[PDB]
Amino acid sequence: SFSMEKVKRILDAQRTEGPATVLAIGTANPPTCFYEADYPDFYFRVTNCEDKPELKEKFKRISERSAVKKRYLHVTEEILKENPNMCSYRAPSLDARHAILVEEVPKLGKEAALKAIKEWGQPLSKITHLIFSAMSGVDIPGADFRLMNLLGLEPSVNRLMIYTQGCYMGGAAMRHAKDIAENNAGARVLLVFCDLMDMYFHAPQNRVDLLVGQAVFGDGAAALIVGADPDDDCTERPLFQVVSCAERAVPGTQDYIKAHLKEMGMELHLSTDVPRMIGKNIEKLLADAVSPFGISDWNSLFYIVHPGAVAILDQVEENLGLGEDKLRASRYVLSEYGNMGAASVFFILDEMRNKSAEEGKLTTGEGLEWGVLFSFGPGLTVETVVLLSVPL
Amino acid sequence: SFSMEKVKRILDAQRTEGPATVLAIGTANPPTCFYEADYPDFYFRVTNCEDKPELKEKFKRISERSAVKKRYLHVTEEILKENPNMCSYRAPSLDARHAILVEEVPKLGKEAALKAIKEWGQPLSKITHLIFSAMSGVDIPGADFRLMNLLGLEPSVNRLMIYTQGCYMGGAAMRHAKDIAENNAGARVLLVFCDLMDMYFHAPQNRVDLLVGQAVFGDGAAALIVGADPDDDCTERPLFQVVSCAERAVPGTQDYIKAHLKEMGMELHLSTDVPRMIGKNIEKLLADAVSPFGISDWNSLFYIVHPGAVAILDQVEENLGLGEDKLRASRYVLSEYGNMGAASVFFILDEMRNKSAEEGKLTTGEGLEWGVLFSFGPGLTVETVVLLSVPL
């Protein structure tokens, strides 16, 4: 009865008022830029597969239809010479690949995080939580721990490390940052995604899905600061507000995306029915998300759509009845960066906020007030994040 | 300015009143019981190492000093015959191991979860969140996804899957469960830990840490339901309340615990200075956690201590001045089960609620009101979770 008064003082003390908001965004990529026109030539050469010209022409057509202009890749010609088993299909190469990633993943995360923290402008000691999402680079301690030390965070930073889960993680980790920020006054969350696709590099196979991956997977890292209740007394300024987060596993699609961690690396299996399956469901998912806020004209939203493959963007555009320019920002990131896993939606959100100011729009959301963020991954998981833009 | 009013109706609707509380605990273990007396004979025979009788004596002395009576292990003699590369040191065996685990991890998680759900007594459709923590079994889709389908959870259940992180996950996943439960009215979180140590089974080496791990690591899974604001109108009934969660990386201990995922499986590195380091820091961590609640007599708390090794329990007892019976429940779980990774503290918490009832105590925390839960892992991370018991 007095111990319960202590608990209620703790609960009262932690309450927040406003919603979780994104306070800064920073991105970073490997230094090596690979242009899509040269990649079939580079890829088949460096894998000593120039004696497979029909397969090469098949890959060229997939790359040309991919709508990817360039990618920044961590895998270089030097790296493949020093670890040739990566170019020998199913040969053991997991040790070599992991040695390469274990230090580079936190290293690239740091570069993006520094940018986010710089824009944020607050001292590192104000960061209370760190969430690290990384497709590859599994290690104990994790990249969360490494980045905490590289950045000089407080040893009391609350850490969450999510390894090897898929492209739905952009929306998923965003939900957790929201729950953290809103349940804890003063909480300031550094949310970092680093997806290096080195584990998915294999010699070309006569497999459409593996070829699409080789054409589309790109590397990058994205960092955000997420918090509730911005302090006016300092230079904290919101970019977007996270209103509601939803997740759904599509029934009957277990086998559409599978990927196995093996001695040869990451073994991918991706059904070509993924975009249609996404397109068949997207409107009902959007409708469930935004009806509670009275939105029924889909073109009244601004869009951040995970660019898993260009077919995915087209399917969304088609089955939502979107104007041709609605997915401009998503197509841009797909074009300039490829599919960077979970980081992609945050490259897009970064692009949208910058393009809006550059074009003089009245909000961070292309002049609109409400928007939605979609991530897609195994199997099949769809993330639906409702956003509010901020005025300019 | 009317849309900002829409956001406030959502937030107001999602507020909770009370703290996150654990509403049920369920545990499960593999079927095969290995007695610690017999393990040195079994272990060195089945690894064809009876020709190292001095190493076997070094292993036996560690086993006898271990304070482990028995363990339930998934690794059987049959499994090792079907996968002999698990017994040849550094031979490639990661593929063989992962195939064994990817279906067993969710299966044992299901066994524990069903019990927790049984005690909980609500319909599965009420579970809004699933958090799965597993040391081993990295797969896409994850064990969370498999478990959702094994149990028949709603496809809209919000999932979080954490692979390969260490024994601090007990307290860490508990923090995230607290944030979800408190930030989302109606939320009921299914929290599942399954750590199968098959990835750490190797031929005996003349390495103290690997031998101790071979003596102490056991297999098991523990499941919890966590929610804020228990319903009186139904059979929901709280066991403990989660008051505050803190996490700390001990400065200068990066290398004390390391583990690398390689082609041979999990390659562990564990310094013997761990218990001393833990003992050296435990009081300052405990004091920071419970001083805000006016607590300065450490024997006024009940204890759940991660049983990483008996040396750790002894160090915690010594450096806090605990009475000889304070750590009864923790040493019990170590005795009867070994070190089951992150699931352990929940076996202990389960043991404590049951022993307290069996002894007719007036609360679930051995008659005391306030208590603390400790998890330790890489590198070095310590979780301090302050608990409130419930009357009986």
Answer yes or no: are the C-beta atoms of A115 and A150 closer than 8 Å: no
Q: Which two tokens stand for residue A182?
A: 């809103």
CA B117, CA A345: separation in Å to the nearest integer? 36
Cβ separation A293–B3 shorter than 8 A: yes
Q: 3-state SS of B347-382?
A: HHHHHHHHHHHHCCCCECECCECEEEEEEEECCCEE
How many other CB atoms are there within 10 angstroms of residue B211's CB atom? 20
Rounded to a whole number of angstroms, the CA Rg of chain B reads 21
CA B184, CA B157: separation in Å to the nearest integer? 13
Residue count (chain B):
392
Answer yes or no: are the C-beta atoms of B150 and B110 closer than 8 Å: yes
CA B104, CA B73: separation in Å to the nearest integer? 12
Cβ separation B140–A262 shorter than 8 A: no
Hey, which bits of A9-114 come out as E strands?
21-28, 33-35, 70-72
Residues forming beta bridges with residue B221, ordered by sequence position: B28, B194
Helix residue ranges per DSSP H, B16-160: 39-46, 53-64, 77-82, 94-120, 143-151
User: Comparing C-alpha atoms, which of A124, A309, A110, A125 is closest to residue A209?
Assistant: A309
Amino acid at A160: L
User: Comparing C-alpha atoms, which of A245, A250, A193, A284 is closest to residue A381?
Assistant: A250
CA A224, CA B115: separation in Å to the nearest integer? 39
Residue B168's Cβ-count burial label (10 Å; 0-12, 13-18, 19+) is buried
DSSP code per residue over A110-161: HHHHHHHHHHH-S-GGG--EEEEEESS--EES-HHHHHHHHHT--TT-EEEE
Answer yes or no: are the C-beta atoms of B148 and B130 closer than 8 Å: yes
In terms of CA atoms, which chain A residue is nearest residue B289?
A156
Residues forming beta bridges with residue A244, ordered by sequence position: A386
Q: Which CATH architecture has domain B1-238?
A: 3-Layer(aba) Sandwich (3.40)
Cis peptide preceding B380, ω within 30 of 0: yes
Answer yes or no: are the C-beta atoms of A199 and A266 closer than 8 Å: yes
Catalytic site positions of A = 167
How many other CB atoms are there within 10 angstroms of residue B323's CB atom? 11
Residue to substitute from B261, B370, B376, B380, interface A, most A β-carbons within 10 A: B261
Q: Which residue has the tokens 């919101």?
A: A238
Helix residue ranges per DSSP H, B247-323: 274-290, 310-320
Please list, residue by residue across A40-70, b when 16 or more beta carbons sit within 10 angstroms of its beta carbon and e when fewer do: beebbebbebeebeebbebbbebbeebbbeb
CA–chain centroid gap for A45, Å, is 30
State how far residue B9 is from chain A, nearest Cα, in angstroms. Answer: 10
Name the catalytic one among B49, B167, B194, B245: B167
Answer yes or no: are the C-beta atoms of B308 and B376 closer than 8 Å: yes
Amino acid at A19: P
Residue A88's Cβ-count burial label (10 Å; 0-12, 13-18, 19+) is middle
Q: What is the 8-class DSSP label of residue A223?
A: E
Cα dihedral B327, B333, B339, B345 in deg (nearest 10): -70
Answer yes or no: are the C-beta atoms of B164 and B197 closer than 8 Å: no
Cβ-Cβ contacts under 8 Å for B220 (sequence gap 6 or more): B27, B28, B29, B30, B72, B108, B112, B194, B195, B337, B340, B343, B344, B347
Question: Which element (helix H / strand E) includes B131?
Answer: strand B129-134
Answer yes or no: are the C-beta atoms of A153 and A139 closer than 8 Å: no
Answer yes or no: are the C-beta atoms of B216 and B342 closer than 8 Å: no
Q: Classify B259 in phi/psi space as left (phi over 0), alpha (psi -120 to 50) or beta.
A: beta
CA A351, CA A347: separation in Å to the nearest integer? 6
In terms of CA atoms, which chain B residue is nearest residue A255?
B141
Answer yes or no: are the C-beta atoms of B20 and B229 closer than 8 Å: no
Cβ separation A379–B161 shorter than 8 A: no
Which of A17, A142, A180 comes nearest B179 by C-beta? A180
User: Comparing C-alpha atoms, which of A133, A192, A128 is closest to residue A161?
Assistant: A133
- Using a CB-CB distance cutoff of 8 angstroms, which residues of chain A are in contact with residue B294? 6
State how far residue B115 is from chain A, nearest Cα, in angstroms. Answer: 25
Domain with CATH 3.40.47.10 in chain A: 1-238, 239-391
A239-391: CATH, from 3.40.960.10, 3.40.1550.20, 3.40.47.10, 3.60.40.10: 3.40.47.10
Measured CA to CA in angstroms, residue B311 lies from B272, B295, B331, B383 at distances of: 10, 26, 11, 18
Cβ separation A98–B139 shorter than 8 A: no
State how far residue A54 is from chain B, nearest Cα, in angstroms. Answer: 31
DSSP code per residue over B239-269: SEEEEEEEEEE-TT-TTTEEEEEETTEEEEE
Beta strands A370-377 and A381-389 are: antiparallel
**First and final C-alpha spacing in chain B:** 50
Q: In this structure, is the dihedral angle defined by the CA atoms of residues A320, A321, A326 and A330, taken in order, positive or negative?
A: positive
Answer yes or no: are the C-beta atoms of B357 and B363 closer than 8 Å: no
- Tell me the technique behind this structure: X-ray
